Structures are given as C-alpha cells and as structure tokens.
Amino acid sequence: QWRDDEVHFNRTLDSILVPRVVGSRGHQQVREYLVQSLNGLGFQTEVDEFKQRVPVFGELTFANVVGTINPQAQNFLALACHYDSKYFPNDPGFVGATDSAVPCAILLNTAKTLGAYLQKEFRNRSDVGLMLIFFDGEEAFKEWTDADSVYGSKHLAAKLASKRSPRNIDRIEVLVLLDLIGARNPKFSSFYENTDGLHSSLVQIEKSLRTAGQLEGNNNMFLSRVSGGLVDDDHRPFLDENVPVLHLVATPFPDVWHTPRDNAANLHWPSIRNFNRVFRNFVYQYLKRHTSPVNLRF
Ligand SMILES: *[C@@H]1O[C@H](CO)[C@@H](O[C@@H]2O[C@H](CO)[C@@H](O)[C@H](O)[C@H]2NC(C)=O)[C@H](O)[C@H]1NC(C)=O
Numbered sequence: 001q002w003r004d005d006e007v008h009f010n011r012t013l014d015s016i017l018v019p020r021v022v023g024s025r026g027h028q029q030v031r032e033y034l035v036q037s038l039n040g041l042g043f044q045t046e047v048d049e050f051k052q053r054v055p056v057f058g059e060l061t062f063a064n065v066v067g068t069i070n071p072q073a074q075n076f077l078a079l080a081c082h083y084d085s086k087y088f089p090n091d092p093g094f095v096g097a098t099d100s101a102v103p104c105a106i107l108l109n110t111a112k113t114l115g116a117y118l119q120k121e122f123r124n125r126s127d128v129g130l131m132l133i134f135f136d137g138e139e140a141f142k143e144w145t146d147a148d149s150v151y152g153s154k155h156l157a158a159k160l161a162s163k164r165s166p167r168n169i170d171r172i173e174v175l176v177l178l179d180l181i182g183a184r185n186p187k188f189s190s191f192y193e194n195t196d197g198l199h200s201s202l203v204q205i206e207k208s209l210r211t212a213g214q215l216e217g218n219n220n221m222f223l224s225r226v227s228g229g230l231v232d233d234d235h236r237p238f239l240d241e242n243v244p245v246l247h248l249v250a251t252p253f254p255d256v257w258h259t260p261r262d263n264a265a266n267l268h269w270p271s272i273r274n275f276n277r278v279f280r281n282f283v284y285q286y287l288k289r290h291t292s293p294v295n296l297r298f
C-alpha cells in the first residue's frame, strides 16, 4: 500500500552527495540540510555537538543529528547511518555514495513515504517512538582503529547512557544501522541472534513483495543466514551499552568501497528501489505491530 517517492529520494540524495569530511563546508551544509529535512518531516530535532582532537587535523567540531517522533514514548525504534565522508589526501572529491549518502537518503525517504502514518496516527500513542540518527565522524581520519573511528557514535552513546527521564539508551529497543547500500545486488545477512527475528521479517517482507510483483529484477537481497563475520561500525559504542543491533550492511562490500568510484555513476537504482520497498514496510510493520516493550537484550 505504501507508494514509492523516488523524486524525494533523488533530490534528497543530490543534497547529501557532496564532499563532507568533518570540518568541511560540505559537511556543514549537509548537517544543516539534515536538520531542516528532519524538521520538515515532523521530527523533533536535536544536535549533539562536541569538540575532539583527532589525527591529522587536531581539534574538530562534530555534530550528531537526531530526529524523534514521540519523544516521551516509553521505547524507541532507532534507525541510523553516518553522514560524514572519509578524508582522502589524494581524493578530495570523494563523496561516499554508498558510504553513506544513500543510507542517509533512505532514512529520510522512509520518513517521507510513511509520512501519512508517522505525522498522524503514529503520534497518538505513548508506547513507541521513532528515532533517526545521523552519526557524525564514523570514518577514521588516518587509519581505522578502535580509537580512530566512530567519534560521533561514541559521544552519542555516552550522552544517551548518562541521561534518565530508566536510561535514555535503554529505551532503544533496537539500533537498525544502515551502511554501504546503493551498489548492485547487495546481500544482507543476520549478524546477531537477538535480532534474527527482525532479519527474518525483512526476508519475509522481500519474499512477499516479490510474490506480489512489487520488486525490480530477479535478485533477493535479504539472505536467510547468519553471517560468519562482523563489520566494525557506528553500532560498536551501542554494543558496549548492550543495545540490540540489526546491522544492515551489505557483505561483500560494494566493489567501490573507499575508492574514487564510490559515486552516483556506480549506484544501482533498481537495488535501491527494492531496498526502500522492503525497508519502509519493515519500519511501518514494526511500529504498527508494537504493543509491549520489545526486549531483545538476550
Ligand atoms: C532518479 O535518479 C535516477 C538516476 O539518475 C534516474 O534513473 C535514470 O533515469 C533515466 C530516465 O529513465 C535513464 O535514462 C537513466 O538511465 C537512469 N539512470 C540510472 C543511473 O539508473 C531516475 O529516473 C530518477 N527518478 C525520478 C523519478 O526522477
């Protein structure tokens, strides 16, 4: 029943798909664009801004952007991406199309396509709300290590853990983190036993949409298997606080990952479209079905 809005998606992606290393002009423009976009989609918007010294550049100002609908709800579904792009000395024009402009565009477009629900009937409840989290400073400035990585996520997890209104971080039922989406024929495996039921939901929704003739082409992206390895990402500081994670990161990685080829020209629209159809229904169904607190901390 939920229709595509590809005009919105495209125009959103165009607005984000600019060089946006933390501290750059493009990063500032994207931050402002995210905040404006969230406000216009009906979210209560907050920015978690902070300074931190990193390799190469010294002190930089980071800002996570968080939008919430039903901020006084008991629990939250949280959907996330990173909005910074990776600094490359020899590639100042790097735009990280899959990493993670498309992921961020997907979250905003999910909010757009379900707007008739999110901005109306969904507001009339106290059991669940929706959080969209745009992490800053996911990328290493010199070399990915536990230290040089995920600066925004580290800060936001600490912030959410340090507040009570139970701890704010504890009201997050699951962190659904989208990364490395946009390439052709992506494959998503379940990383964690505790969110396998949610993964199974994605699989079932994709099967159902295919049977209804609603998917483009012949690939299925949601695999019914547990992945044998893990991908380090923005959810690490949330694991550290026992938050359940559904990690929607394609493996294998896009061919273009961390190369000058991670651009608009190498995106695969039919895959993006299929992702959006499954994902928007997954989010709607999670919210629609919710009654009691979902407790996947096991
Ligand atoms: C959203 O953007 C994509 C990418 O530019 C558009 O897909 C292109 O559409 C034109 C017209 O059909 C084709 O000639 C190109 O081959 C497509 N390019 C790619 C990379 O797929 C799509 O049309 C846009 N959607 C809307 C609604 O404007």
Ligand SMILES: COc1ccc(NC(=S)NCCCn2ccnc2)cc1OC
Pocket: 099, 139, 144, 179, 230, 231, 232, 233, 251, 252, 253, 257
């Ligand atoms: C080249 O293929 C891979 C390379 C590395 C890893 N493993 C990890 S733990 N990477 C951390 C990625 C952090 N990140 C996310 C977005 N931008 C940076 C897995 C790969 O294939 C499964």
Ligand SMILES: [Zn+2]
Pocket: 086, 099, 139, 258
């Ligand atoms: Zn990256």
